[model samples]
Structure formats: C-alpha cells, structure tokens
Target: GNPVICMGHHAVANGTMVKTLADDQVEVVTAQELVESQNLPELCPSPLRLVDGQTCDIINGALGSPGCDHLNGAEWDVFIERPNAVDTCYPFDVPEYQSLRSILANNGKFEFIAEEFQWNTVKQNGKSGACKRANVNDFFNRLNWLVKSDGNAYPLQNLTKINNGDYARLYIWGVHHPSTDTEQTNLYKNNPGGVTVSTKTSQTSVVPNIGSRPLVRGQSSRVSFYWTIVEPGDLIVFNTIGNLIAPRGHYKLNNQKKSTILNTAIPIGSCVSKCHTDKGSLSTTKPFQNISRIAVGDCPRYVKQGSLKLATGMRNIPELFGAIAGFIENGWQGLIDGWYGFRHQNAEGTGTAADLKSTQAAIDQINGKLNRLIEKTNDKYHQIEKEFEQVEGRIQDLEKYVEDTKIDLWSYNAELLVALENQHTIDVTDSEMNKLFERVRRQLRENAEDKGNGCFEIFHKCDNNCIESIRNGTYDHDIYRDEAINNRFQ
Candidate 1:
C-alpha cells in the first residue's frame, strides 16, 4: 500500500491491517491501521484546498486526532538527519531557514552548521533521497521513521517538552531509506524502495534549543552575538533582486574582511588554541555595550564519529602507526640532540676543555706535589745555616790566636833576660850563654808563626820622632812611653 495513501497526514488501523489514506477527496487507500485493535474505520469529509497551490487533503477513515486539516502552501515541516540524527525541518523560503538557525544559535545550541542542503544524495547507503512538500506524494514510503510526537533525536532531545509560545511546525526528514517494511526507523536509509517523513507541532514564537555543547567544543571564528531576544526570524534579509535589506543587527566582523575558511574536520587528537566567556544576557543590554569580545578560540568544531577531540587523549591504532612512521622519517634526532651540545656554537677547542673529574685521589696527588716543593725550600734555608756555622767559629778563634802569639813572645823575652842575668852573675862560659839565647830565639820565632799584622801596629807610638826611633830600634819618652802603655808591660 502507498505510504501517503495509507499513513500520510491522515491514517487508520482496522483490526484487519494498519494503513493510511489521503483526504476524503483524495484517492484513498482503504483506512490506515492508524486506529487501534478491533476498531473498524468510518468515512470523513475533506478540508479546503489552496487557490494558488495544490491542497492535498487526505482522510484516513480511522485516524483518532481531530486536527488533520493542514494547508499545503502554508504548512511548515520538521526533519531529523539519520545516522547523525540532528533535528531539522523543511523550510519553504530563506526566511524560514534563517528563523530555524537563529533559534538554535541564540540558545546554547552552537554545534549545528547550516550549509547548502543537497536535495538528492545517498545518505546512510544510497537508499534515502530528498523530500519536497510539492512532490511528497510522488515518492514512496515515509513517516514511520519519525520520532513519536515527543520522541527523541540527537543534540536536542528535550525539545518536545516545551508546550509553549511561537507556533513551530516540525517535520522530521529521513536520513535513511524508509521502509520499516524492509526494516524499521533504525535502518532508515537502508530501506530499498521505501522512504518516510514524520512531523510534529511546537507552539512557540521562539524555538527552544537544548544547545549543542559538544558541537561547539573546538570550532574557530564562530561569531557570537548580543542581538535582542527576538522571535526566531531573519538574521539578515534581502529582496529578490539580491540587494541586502539592512537596518538590523550589529552586523560586523572585526570590521574584518577576509575569506572565511570552513573546516570540515576538527580536534581529531590535535591541540588547537581556544577561549570563551560568560556575560550578561541580551535585550535589556545594548548590542555590544558591555558584551565581552570573542575569545581566542571561540567557534564551532565538527568531526567524524567517535574521533578524539582534546589534545590529551591516547590515539587509535592508525594514528599511532602514523606517529611511528613520522619518527622513522626523522632520524634518531631527539635522543641524539640531548646527547650532544653546542653544535651551533663556534668557539671551543682543546685548550678550552678536555676532561673533568671530582675524584679525591687525583686531588691528593696535586696536593702532595705542593707539599714537596715547600719541603725543598725549607731544606735550602737549613743548609745555609749549617755552612754559616763554620765561618762563625773561625771568627771566634781569630782573637784567641793573636793573644797566644803575644803571650809567647813576652815569655820568650823574659826567659832570655833571666838567662842573661844568670850568665853575668855566675861568670859562666860565653858559648853556653849564647846557646841558651839562641834556643829562646828559635822558640820566639815559632810563637810568631801565627801572629797577625795588627801586632806591629799595636806597639807603635804616634809622634814622628818616636816613629823614627822605633825604626832605628830605639825607645822613646822619659819613661816607658811618652805614650802610656799597659802598666804591667811598662
């Protein structure tokens, strides 16, 4: 059975089977199993159609809800991406899309990124394709993949809880091929030949965002705003002619103009510079008045599934292998560098330094040599004193020798005088007396052998007449010496 004809906006479930049907005016497919067990279906009337566009009013004979009269051109939708499971919706115009993006951004939901949506592409496998409001019936199975009216999806699972203001109609789009017939909502895109779309309504002027904290973890240059707490609507606007319709926003860069690089992969085990801050709220605050600036690394970050984010974590096997390969390409340079130094320096040589040691035995050898040098100096001074002792003794003996010489001479003269007197008194032979005198002369000569030259000067008188008399061997002065001599000698 056709999905739109069975479970579109209207559906029914008879005890026989489950199915959906178009409006009462539509080509109906019996009633959808939209009804619970044991319940048969009943026929219903159609709603109004569009004057300008096609109005698809289909009635399942047994859908329980009272509000199925959805308009064609006026209706909004909700879409959820499969695999990623991000909450999204179909927007008929650019304004609708901007309104959706702004609601997510103004809240803490900073993770999502909006880009050109490819209507035709393979997602999850090639089974899921694009969705269109005008062409909704042209395709096959959809709708079962939707979360229940309050069911969950990624990033903002808390959305369905807000039964509040801003009327937002959410239509969930399939990320996978729809054929719960082939599989279920879990296999989404894997469904061949079957697809689905589901929708819900959120009553709000502002879309509630359960912010994307994980998504914004390490992004770059994501400009944060201080705009008024506006109802979700245009961030920027334009006419059909492509001229910008301004009169809105603090519209700025860093007043910066440059190409913005969109990074696809982020923080996959690499450390990047980043920063952020919390500040006062918007509306009551003027735009950028007390608002803080964007910090160093403030922005959105994106990555493939389960890849590492922070710089600190351990790596996968492929990453570890790549790191090892990098080291291989480099030499053993790290260990080598630490092992040596001063490679860039030019000023050092053999005289500069050779070896070094702190061993105490080596120091002791140097000290011992120094002690030997001191000992040698002491030996030289002591040898000088020993040699000088001989000269000192010789000086002491010099005067004694002169004294002995004088004494011997004196004794010789006295002995000779005594012998002269004895010979004259006794009248002895002349030869005997002569021989005694000669013996005395020889002894006197022996005594004079050691006498000094000062002995002659010691006996001299100062007057010229006395000196001449001494020369002639004569005595001077009325008595023993006009010059006084020693009393004993006189």
Candidate 2:
C-alpha cells in the first residue's frame, strides 16, 4: 500500500520504497508499519516551481475550498527521504602484498622475537630499493595501485562492512603503504589512534585476531555504508549550479583575482614624492602672504616691475608737487606775504595796512619757531630707535649670561660630588676661594639689577653677528652665566 500523505514537513523512515512519475514522486509520510497507506495530496490551482526542479502547492483538499485563496503564490513541498548513501570502494591486499613483504623485509627488517634469526637471513638476502622521502605524486601513485581495482579488493572488504558505523579505520603497513611503521610512530607521537585495542578476547577487539597489534600483513581496512530510503514521487538532482549558489557567503575569492594586478599597476611614486615634499617644505613660505617677493629681491624695498612700477611712479607725481608747494610756502617771499596779509601795511602814519604788516611779522616769527621744533622732534625719533637697539643688545647679553651660569652650576655640582666621593677637593688658598666667590656674587648681583654689560649686548642685537657669536660663545662669563640662569628659571 502507498503511505499516508502528510500535509506538513516531517521525517521519513527507512526501507520505504519509491517510484518516480513525471519526473516527480510522492513523499514518504511515515514507516510502513507506523501508519496506514494513503494517496498523495492534491496540488493547488497554481503552484511554485523551485529552481531545483521541485514543484509545490497548497493542498486544497485538506484545507477545503479556497480557505487560503487570499495567500498568493503559496508553496507546499513534499518532504521525502533522501537516498544519500554512497559506495566508495577502496582496493586492498593482493599478490602485491608479496612485493611489500619483500621490500619491508629488505628495508625495514621486521622480525618475530622467536624467529629473529630466520628473518635476519631474509633481510640480508632481499633486494633493497632506494631509501629517500616519497614525494606527493609518489604517495598518490602508490595509493592508487593498492586501491585501484574492485576484484583485487581484499583488505577493503572488512572495511566496507565496518563502514556502517560512524567512522571507518584503514590500517596499512610495509615500506610505501599508507600506515607504515614510521607513519604509525609519528601518528602515535602526535595524536592517539582513535581505536583502543584490548588484550582480552581477540573477537571483542577492534579487529579480530589482532591482540593489541595493528592490522597485519597487507594491513586492515574499515569502511562504513549508511542505509537511507528514497520515497515515491521524489527526484535526486546533482544540481551543480544550486550547490554553488546555495553558499553565497562562503565564496569570497571569486573577485579577488585582480587584487595583485591592481596593486602592481597603481601609481604610487607621485603619492610618495608628494608626501616627502610636503614634510620637507613645511613653513618655508613667508607667513601672511603667498607671493614670494622676498626671494625675488631685497625685501621692504620698493618694487620696480612691469606696469606696477610705472603706475607707482605716476602716483608719486602728486607727492612731488606737494613737496614743491611746501617749499614755496616756507620761502622768504611767501613768509613775508603771509605776514603782510595777516596785518595791514603800516608803512605811513600807522594806518590799518601798516598795523597788518606788524602783525604779519609776528606770525612769520611763530611759524619759523614751529618749523625748528618739528625738525628737532624728527631727529629725536630717529635717534631713539638706534638707542633702543643698543639697550636691547645689553638685555640679550644678560639673558645669555644667566643661561651659561645655570649650565656651569650643574656641571660644578656634578664635579663637586665626584671630588667629594674621591676625596680630591681642590687645594686652592682661602683668599683665592673667597675672591672667586665674591666675583660670582658681584656678577649675580649686577645681573639681578640689569647692570651687567658684555660684547654679546651688541652681538646679539646685531642680526648679522648674533648667530655667529652665539655659536662661538664669545660673550663674557658673567653674561653667559646670567643667560643660563634666566633660561633655567624660565
């Protein structure tokens, strides 16, 4: 009888037979003994066909007339037991075993404890192959010969029966076999072999007739074959495309082939050069302006270039005329005219014009006095800048003196500590020590009062000489010590 059809997803039991019809088969509902047999569920008016060639529809008979008519494109699939069992045949021991035995007897010299003498003769007489590490191709070729044919399969028979279990074990021996003595030793050293062989009954052991010994001669092989069922109306598709598309996230190397090519082709020279130039040229340009006119000529001097110089020359014409006008206004005739205009001429009988003339004389005298005052003020302002520069140089010398003093103090302290530790104090006279201390104290007092003077005063204030003087340390000791002290305190 056909199995009962369930309308939902479920697991199917084993031994259930299936037949495909129209490239489709009904799913197995349950084990044959668990439920009574039934027909396949009817398909809906419209069903969805999956990419894997499976079709699904709502079971209208089970849900009654149009119960879920509003649900568009509804899909209902049959859950069938899959026939996933595969037979992987591996060949085994044969007449080739004699070759392996001969090779091992020659190269490995395996001997029983009681029969060591007999085996020693075999080892001494047998032909020997070259002793070297086997390459990948060599291992594969040797493995192929051992497991290539089904009829020649001897060791794999027991393996095929044992493959029913979760894991299968394949044991091999001889010079070039999978499980050689050296390979087994390496395996035991690194990881425990999963199977534990007992010394009890040989029948109860992992392999029969092997007492705590690994598979013998051609080596023991084990395999497992799981039983599964294929239900009615079911189809098995290889679906190479579906298998690839199913794991969309796991395929990361699909577009990574061009990464190396892109890295090689990218232009990195310009970027690297630009980075170096940016670092090296930092703050080289003058601040507050982009035009590097300072490099073109002496800075702060008037520029003479193109239309700009011509335009500047033309603009100065008015200033030239104003200067001429000022000179004319201050001349003797102009002064006399201004005086006469302010006071009337009083040449005859002291009339209004005569009184005006006298007033004009007084006005001329006042203007002459003011002109002299302005000349003196201009001269004083010019001299002040020069005097201030000299004062600034003195201040710089004092600053340098303070700095050197602090450095000397640190050095002196270090030397004093060393001298005390070595008991090698300086043997200077008392008067000499007092004089040196007084000189230091006097210089310190003068520095505090801003009275210390030295060549560095002029040297530091002169931009042309300051850098050289600082490098040469040509300043007086007092000034150097003062500069060192000031810097240290700062």
Candidate 3:
C-alpha cells in the first residue's frame, strides 16, 4: 500500500476506478468502465432563494436582526445573485429619503393635473394666499394610488413657479412597496421602491413688448417706462396646489433695470437696452433731471401797457384867451360910449375898410394857433400806433407764460390725484411722479384723452409733442409768438 501511494493519489482505497491489473501491479480501472456516468452536475429545487436583482423591502413592520432598525417603520433588503450560488441578501442603507406620506406632511407636497399643463397666456391666480384654499381634492382624486406604476406616486411635484425672470427650484420624492409577496421579494430597491424628481424653474416664455418706449441719446432724464404682471404662476406638490409665497408677485409692477443699459452700436429696430431680473416687475429708473423743459425759463417780465391819451370836455387855451379878450373889449367900450353921451359916429363909418382890415389880421393869428394844435394831435395818434405794436408783442409773451404755468400746475395736480388714488398721503416718490407724467403723455398721444389736459378739453394750447420736447432737449424760449423779445429768466 505504501509503495502504490507514491505521490498524492493511491486510488484503490479512494474507490474511483480501483482494480489490480497484475499480481504486483493491481490494475486500476476507471469508474466509467464499472458504471455509466451522467455528463451534467446534480441540482436540487430551492424555496429559500431569490432571482437576481430581487429585493425584500419591509415596507411596514418591526425591525429585523441587523438590517434596518433606524427606518421609520419601513424596512428593505436586496437579492444580489451570486454565480452558481444561492441569492445573497443585502441591506440597502437608507439616506434621508421622502415618501408620499413623508412629502405630504410638509408644504412641498405633490400635485396632480388631469388637464393638459399648457397655457395660452401667462395667468395669475387670485391675490396672494388666495389660492391657498383652492380645491386640492380635484388634483388629489386623480392621484388615486400612492404608487400607480413602477413605485412612483401619480402626479409628481415638478412645477416652474417663478416666471418673471426669476430663478426658482423645487424638489420632491415619493416611495412605495409591492402588495403581492412574490413581487415584494423581486421589487426594485435602488430607489427604495419609489422614484425621486427635481425641478429647477427656468424662464419658459417671455412677456412681449413690455416697457417699450423711445430712448434718445443723452436725454434719459424725465424718461420712464413700466410693465404689469399678466399672470402669476402656482406651485404643484404631490397632491396639493398653492400660489407663490410672494404677495407682490401677483399682478404687481416690476421696475426693470437691466434693460436700461445704454448701447453704443447704431442700429434700427434693434434693442438698445435689455433688462433682466431675478424677480419683480419690469420698469425703468428715476430721471435725474427735474427741470421743466416744456416750460423752460423762470417767470416772464411784466410788461406795462401804454397809457390812454384822451381829449376831455374842457376849453382850449386859445379859446379861453379869445373869451378874455372879448370880455375886456365889452367893458372898456361900454364905458367910453357912456362918457361920450353922444352916438360915436365912427370915422370908420366913414372908414369901414380900415375896420375890415383889422378884423382880418385877428382872424389870421387865431387860425395859425389852431393849425399848431391840430398838428400836435396828429403826432399823438402816431405815437399811439407804435405803442399798440409793443402792447401786442407783450400780450403774446404773457400768453405763453400763462400756458407754461398751466402745464406746471397740471402736473402737480396729477401727482396729488395719483397719491390720493393710491391712498398714500405724501409717500409718492419722484420716480413715481415720472411714471405718472409718462402715462399722461401716452394717454394724450394715443387717445388724445388728456386726463390732466383741462386745456385740451376746451382750449388746447399744446399737444403730446410739446410734452415730448421735454425729453428731446429741444424745448426753448426762442420759439415764441412775439416778434419782440419776451424777457424770461433761465
């Protein structure tokens, strides 16, 4: 036996193909010669095994041995198939996870939409917190099962809530377990019988022609524009839908700034400015220049009108002197006649020609004085004509001054009216005033309905172009109705 067991294989004792071939050399025949052998290996039916990629998730139960004690009444395991071996068990560590019951507890819940998730125009739900009471059952009923297919709950929570150029993100997750015992063992477990979804809100559509206006070079002062929120968006969670938290986000005004950046490149119909905002409405900035260009210069100089020169009902100097002379002649001549006591036979009765010559000389002297008085009257009339010209020019200048003052006063009234309508006492800012003026100008131009133009209703002194001149820097006092200079302080 020791001699036959030369190395590791002394086969006769092992009983494989052990037989002695000769006396000294026992012939070792193969087992195949003794009995026929099957080519395949033996196998047995097993009830304690699982298929590859199968799992045993303890959805709702007490803790198992060393697998899952930290789970929230939920447990899970995986079946990793080994090559030519029984299925192996693996305990998947649960990270901070979320389930339908877990997600619904918080405000970040899932919502279902039976209708198509599309919009013709951006829409704003009611006021802030107004949609909080919206019918969530409508969406929840559609989500009939916690896990409809594949382990995810129906109607996932992924909504782009912030739309007005804002960056918003919402994340949600849901989980479930199979009901059938066999399906539970082969259930998917990498995601823990459920799926996870994350949503980052990006701008899907742009508001068209918001705050469109003409922007002239170096004349931005007194210029303003604005846009309104058309439709505010809502957020969707597992089975709940509600409005955004921001109150101003619903139908609110957004003051745009990025769009106001100046562009140096020359182009027609090209945007010279492009605005952007993480949130809020689209609007422009407050103008720095506050001087009134439409009504340039200070109050005008008061031009005094010419005085009247009238001829009253009184005696002239020449006529008064003539009357005095006649009185002297009557008194002296009567005394002489009484003293003579005789009818003085005029030597002029014998010399009537001499008397006529003396009378003629007196008449000539009176006529010369009268002609001088008439010439003086003619000079006064000429002076009156020149004074009328000056008066007309001054009147026109004063008229313009009145009109300018009217514009200024109208603006003030508008400010007050707007403040009252908004229920603010004096909280209105300069920028707000600028916006009001812009609105007034626009209304005047488009519909010719000057809300502040009391003049246009009765007497239109100017138009929207006149208002626009304030923006163009073309407003000046040089263009006046008067040919003469109308004094206006800068």
Candidate 4:
C-alpha cells in the first residue's frame, strides 16, 4: 500500500545507510538492508507463520499493528522490535515479578528510601554513617531513586534534618518542588543546615600566654609564657606600648611608629645602636632563652618571647637515632654486662674461666674432626667416579656385542635364501619329499626359537634384573650378558 513502508528507528536506519548508501542520512537505507538481509537471519527468518496457518510477511505484520506486538500477536498484524520480545513479555505475570514489585512497595512504605537517602547526608554531618559505616541498611533504597532520577531529587522531603551526607542520596528521589518559607525557616534553624561543624580537641595541654611574673623594669629576672599555632596563615599581633622594646627591634621610637628595618645616624657614643647590638648578642648568647634573665622594671623592661622551648633530654640528637641507641644499650645491657663482669672478676660465686677455656678446646677438636671428614668425602667421590667409568665401559662393550648378533642373524637368513635357491629345481619321490619337508620345518622352527630366545630372553632378564637392581641399588649390565648370549644362539 505505502510501497511496502519500512520505517526503522535509529539502529536499523543507521545500519541501512552504512551498508548500502555508504552515507549516513536521516535513515540509513543501506545499513538497514544489510542488517535486515544479512544480520537478521538469526532474529527473523522467511516463511513467517500465523496461528491460523496462513502465510504472511513479517514486514507487513510489523508495520500493521497498533501495539507493534507482532512477536506475541495471535495474528500477523503486530510488530515486535526484538526476536525474543514474546519470551520477555511472558514473565510479566510470573510470581518473581510480583514478588519484586511487592518488595519495592514495602521498601517505599517503611521510609526505607528516605533513610538510605539521608545516610550520606548524616555522614557528612560527621555522624556515624559515612562510607566507614559497614552496616548500610538503606543504601539500596537511596541508590534506586538516584539512578532513576538522573541525580536530581524528586518528592520533597524535610530539609531541616538534611545534611551534606545526603549529596549522593538526593539524586535518587524524584524532582522536588520549591520550598516554602516555613520549611526554609525550619531548615535554617534546626537542620544544622549542611555538613556538621567538627570541633577538634587540642592534642596537647594549653598553657597561658602570661606566666606568674609581673612586668617590671631593671631587675635581672626570668619569665615564662606560652602560645599555640592554632592554624596556618594566622598571625599574632604582639603589641607593647610605653617604655617596652622588642629584643629584635622595637615597633615605635619616642611615641612614633618606626620601621622594623632600622637605619639611623647617631652620635658615635649614643646607646641606641649599642643597645641594638646588645640585644642581638643576647639572642645568641642566651640560646636557652626559656631559662635566661629578663630585665624587670623601668631601666629597660623586657617581655619574654611567647615561643617556649622545653628542655628535652636529647634535643641535640635526632629522636629516631636516640631511640635506636637507647633501645640497644638498655635492652641487652643486663645480659652482656653480667657476662662481662663474670669474665673480668668473680663478683659472684662459681665463676668458670677454666670451663670456658676447656669449651674452646673442645670446639677446636671438633673443627679438626670435620676437616678430616671433608677430606675423606673428597676421596670417596673420586673412587665412585672411577668405578662408574669402568661400568660405563663394560656397558658399551655389551651394546657392541648385541649389534654384532643382529648382523649374524641377518647373515643366517641370507644363507637360508641361498639354500632355497639351490634346491629350487630338485625333484624327489613323495615319501622322500615329505621327509625333506619335515626336516626343513624342523630347521625353520629351530631358527624361529633361536631368534625368539635372542630377543625375548634378553628382554625378560633385563626387565626383571633392572627392577630388582633398582630396588636394591645393585644394578649391573654384566647380569644380562649371559642371557643376551643364550637368546642370540639358542
């Protein structure tokens, strides 16, 4: 009717264009034909049948139906996209399908989906459920919505309790509607709104910035203070007004702010430059500033630097090296020290220097015995090698004898041939002929027996003796030599 219309979607259209037109268009006719004619034999074949026993074209049936269910249609009026389309549809009413549907419905009813969705949100809030929580009961419910919605939330849930852990989970829910002012206000107040703020406890004890010492001018005294580096990029503003000055450089001079980099031309004997030099010297000279003297009152009051240095026993050495040395010296000191004391002098009863000397003597005696054993082993190895060489030579001789025996048997066969040729034309009486035949038969039997004995006798004896010798470690080629001789001759 419509010139046998073949309307294929993406796959068939692209396939047709690629196969026939060699050009991709809105519909690839060539690719479609290639797929339909060549590749589709496994999917759709000729002589399409109908339940009514009527012959019908599959193409007609595919295009004719409203549901396009030719694969499962009672008549040839439905179209099916796949070959096993009917088979796939067959299980729709099956028990497993109903069971799966029930499982999903029950999961949705129990707020299982919401719990799973909120898991990651809770984790981000620094609660228990991050990836570290192994028992994830609601993970599947959240993932199901996530995969379906393409990473967008649907079916609005309460945001007041939502946390950052819900980021991955939000995708599973259906697209959610915009929030109302009431919901937003509630969320702002109670939700904790996002990932939880983690409060970290300081690992070390904190000491106060000002210690138990009043700031006074000119008495040689000491003060201790402590501060902490709370975070990276944080600055501490240490300010001192009045007559106080920083040991490195004072911030202000004569009530005016001065540059930290000092460059001044003053009378040669004035105290300004001299005082600066004195402070520089103090930093180097009093390396133990924690214990160093600080000027107390008016003459030149000093503020101890907030940076505190604790007296660690082995601060000069690396901690790792100190630990290793300490472990070795302390760990084995008792045993080694006791041994050394015993050797030097008898602080304890029953010391044994004579016993130690005797022990050394015994060790030397054993070393001498080992040396003699090594020499004996070398001699024995050479002796065994010599014996092996003799046995090997005998085996070679026996092999040669067997080869010669084979040649002799071939020569005997040749002689029989010659004898037969010589008697080819001879005539005799019947009785005489019978007697002659009997003699020839006896000779043939003797030859056969001789040959059989030659091969079989040697084979039998070699097999038995080899097995026995291998078990007892007494294998010798000479044992088979007499058997080989008897086999060849008799």
Best by TM-score: 1
What tens digits encode model 4's per-residue C-alpha lDDT throughout 1-490? 0000010011111111110111122111111010000111111111221121112122212111122232222322111112222211000011233232222221211111223223222111211121112333221111221111223212222222222231111111111111333432222222212211111323222111212333232212221111112222222222211101111111111121111111111112211111111112111211112221211011111213322111101111111122212221211122211111111111122211112222233234322232232122110000001111244466557655664554465344433332332122111111222232233224222221212101111222323334333223364545544654455465
Error of 3 at 54 (Å): 44
Question: What are the TM-scores, per candidate, against the unseen true structure?
Answer: 0.14, 0.10, 0.12, 0.12
Local distance difference test, each candidate = 0.20, 0.20, 0.21, 0.20
- Candidate 4 residue runs with Cα over 4 Å from true position: 1-163, 166-467, 470-474
Writing each residue's lDDT as its tens digit, candidate 2 over 1-490 gives 1101000011213213222221121222211111111111221111211111112111111111122222222211111111221111221222333233222222211111111111110112111121112311111111111211223211211111111222212212111123333333222221112222111122111211111324432234321111111122221111110000010000011111111000011111211110001011111111111121111111111112111100000000110122111211211122222221111111121111112333333334322232232131110000001111244466556655664554455344433332231111111111222232233334333222221211111111222232222223342435545554564355
* lDDT-best of 1 and 4: 4
Residue 56, model 1: lDDT of 21
lDDT tens digits, residue span 245-313, model 1: 111111111111111111111111122212111121111100011122211112111111111111110
How many clashes in each candidate?
A: 54, 40, 24, 34
Cα error, candidate 2, residue 69 (Å): 35
